[PDB]
Amino acid sequence: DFPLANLFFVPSEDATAFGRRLRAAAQQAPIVFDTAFGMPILLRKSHITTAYRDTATFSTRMFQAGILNGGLAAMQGDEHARMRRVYNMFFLPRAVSQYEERFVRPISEQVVDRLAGKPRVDLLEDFAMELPRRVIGELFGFPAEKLHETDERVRAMLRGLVRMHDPAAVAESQRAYGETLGLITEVVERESRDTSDTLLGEILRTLKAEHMDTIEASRQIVLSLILGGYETTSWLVANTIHALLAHPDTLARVRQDPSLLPAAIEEGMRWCPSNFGVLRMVERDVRLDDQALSAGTVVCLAGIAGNYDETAYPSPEVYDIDRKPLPAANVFGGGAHFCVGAPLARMEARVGLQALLARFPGLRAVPEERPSFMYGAKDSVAHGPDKLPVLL
Numbered sequence: 053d054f055p056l057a058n059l060f061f062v063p064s065e066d067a068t069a070f071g072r073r074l075r076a077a078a079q080q081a082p083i084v085f086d087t088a089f090g091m092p093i094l095l096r097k098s099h100i101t102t103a104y105r106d107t108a109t110f111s112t113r114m115f116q117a118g119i120l121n122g123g124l125a126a127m128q129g130d131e132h133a134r135m136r137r138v139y140n141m142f143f144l145p146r147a148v149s150q151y152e153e154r155f156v157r158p159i160s161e162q163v164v165d166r167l168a169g170k171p172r173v174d175l176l177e178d179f180a181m182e183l184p185r186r187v188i189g190e191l192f193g194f195p196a197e198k199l200h201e202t203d204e205r206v207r208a209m210l211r212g213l214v215r216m217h218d219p220a221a222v223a224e225s226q227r228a229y230g231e232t233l234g235l236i237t238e239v240v241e242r243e244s245r246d247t248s249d250t251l252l253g254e255i256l257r258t259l260k261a262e263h264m265d266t267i268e269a270s271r272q273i274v275l276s277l278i279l280g281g282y283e284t285t286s287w288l289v290a291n292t293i294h295a296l297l298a299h300p301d302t303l304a305r306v307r308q309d310p311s312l313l314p315a316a317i318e319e320g321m322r323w324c325p326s327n328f329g330v331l332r333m334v335e336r337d338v339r340l341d342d343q344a345l346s347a348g349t350v351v352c353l354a355g356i357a358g359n360y361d362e363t364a365y366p367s368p369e370v371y372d373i374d375r376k377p378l379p380a381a382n383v384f385g386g387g388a389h390f391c392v393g394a395p396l397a398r399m400e401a402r403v404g405l406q407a408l409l410a411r412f413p414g415l416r417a418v419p420e421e422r423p424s425f426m427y428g429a430k431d432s433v434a435h436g437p438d439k440l441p442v443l444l
């Protein structure tokens with residue numbers, strides 16, 4: 053039994069409130085029970101890094117009861133490493149740079165172009181959501197407005213991958229995936245043809261060459277590009293935008309020198325993380341210092357609690373793109389499951405923000421309307437703003 057804490061479901065106009073809450077809780081106890089979120093939360097750095105590394109004690113098996121069964125995240129040990137190698141190939145530095153020139157740079161120019169002719173826009177819906185959606189489109193050879201229509205189902209899918217102790221959340225997730233399976237099957241069938249010229253077509257050929265091209269594997273490839281490449285990446289872009297908007301002098305520096313964008317992106321992941329960490333299944337009784345966890349417990353590794361550890365990052369409430377070494381990205385997880393798509397997400401954030409800042413030198417937040425930040429923004433599983441109104 054752990055002390056109670058209320059870390060997740062608390063709204064604030066301060067983007068730092070989430071990180072500050074987690075840090076303040078971590079100073080008081082290593083492990084807390086977040087009643088509204090509904091599970092124990094590991095907050096102490098030593099416990100978290102141990103958990104990420106000891107996959108035999110802290111597994112991803114809970115994923116086998118839900119729509120990710122048969123995907124990469126649900127695999128363990130040797131099965132996992134072999135398929136992981138195959139996913140890794142499509143996010144290598146060279147591959148990502150081809151995506152940048154062919155797909156993401158031009159698309160970014162087009163998304164930013166359609167914001168002009170409006171004195172004010174919501175950069176959340178019109179930019180952070182729109183750009184990753186359209187990238188996943190071009191990787192599929194498939195229209196982005198068709199993905200736009202899956203939004204309620206995409207977030208329904210994701211919510212059942214987080215609050216897995218909730219039977220209703222899990223069942224709605226399975227339902228939403230079932231309602232998306234026709235579309236998934238359409239994309240797979242079309243891009244499995246020799247006539248296929250898309251990246252997704254490249255991917256399905258590689259799976260076949262390793263004799264891994266089951267219906268299930270091909271569906272989970274597509275599913276992860278939707279859940280990760282579209283919805284999750286959106287909140288990274290959105291939180292990076294906000295951090296700059298909320299720091300006009302830094303925004304100006306970054307516009308004048310775009311080579312600062314990677315640091316701005318990493319610092320934004322520290323200062324305003326869009327994800328908290330990961331979920332794990334405790335597979336055997338384990339003692340963490342004087343804490344005990346029972347086998348069968350699903351826990352949250354809230355690695356972003358270290359984002360506000362002032363011993364690592366002094367004045368952690370300050371957005372400082374000049375921190376060196378750059379803060380460790382905890383929003384991508386840890387250990388062998390560490391996000392394989394991270395290189396694409398980082399590149400989309402850099403290229404999109406570069407086009408946005410170059411096209412609108414006068415860009416600024418709407419002074420009256422402050423965003424509200426919370427975990428679960430617009431029914432997502434991200435910590436992010438409810439809106440990003442700007443003046444162009």
Ligand code: HEM
Pocket residue numbers: 112124125126136139276277280281282284285286287288326327329330331383384385386388389390391392393394396397
């Ligand atoms: C801002 C963007 C993203 C964030 C914050 C993020 C976060 C994460 C995290 C924390 C994990 C680990 C889950 C766990 O260990 O339980 C993960 C895994 C994964 N993510 Fe990402 N992700 C992002 C974008 C993407 C993209 C763009 C893709 C693919 C195009 C993607 C695909 C995957 C896959 C396939 C895995 C499973 C990896 C494995 O188990 O080996 N994600 N992601």
Ligand SMILES: N[C@@H](Cc1c[nH]c[nH+]1)C(=O)O
Pocket residue numbers: 125210213276279280281284391
């Ligand atoms: N949660 C979904 C989508 C996602 C990918 N990366 C981060 N999130 C999954 O684990 O695939």
